[PDB]
Ligand binder design. Sequence first.
Ligand SMILES: [Mg+2]
Ligand SMILES: [Mg+2]
Length: 69
Amino acid sequence: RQGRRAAYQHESFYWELAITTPRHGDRPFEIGHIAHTELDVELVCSDTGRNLGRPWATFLVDAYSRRLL
DNA sequence: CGTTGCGGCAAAGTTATGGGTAAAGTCACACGTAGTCACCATAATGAAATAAGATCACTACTGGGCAGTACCAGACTCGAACTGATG
Ligand SMILES: [Mg+2]
Ligand SMILES: [Mg+2]
């Protein structure tokens, strides 16, 4: 009906019967994620005060402690 | 006198309403919302044009003066001659 990107919410999860390597990390600085986004905020210039559009934030996260590295 | 129905009194029973606390749900993070014709009045030239103005050329009408002519004396000047005083 809508496509694969819409059925992605109706996906079967992965449930661990046995214990493989842990998904989020055995220790800090083992698995760390990089991801970009654009912040939902309009920013103004510091000198001339025009609309500069929405900025972009990139995050590096330690997946074990979920810490924003 | 004893019994029976009726009514007051005060817990007791049932709903309702505004509080607190853990615990089942809920939903966005997944690159994204701003973006684009349609609209008719006003300035604003630049061109188109003006309506009158400017000058040429011709036609007719009407003031009107200059080089030259002419006479009638009055008046000053002077050839030519007359005539008187004189050394
Ligand atoms: Mg992203
Ligand atoms: Mg977003």
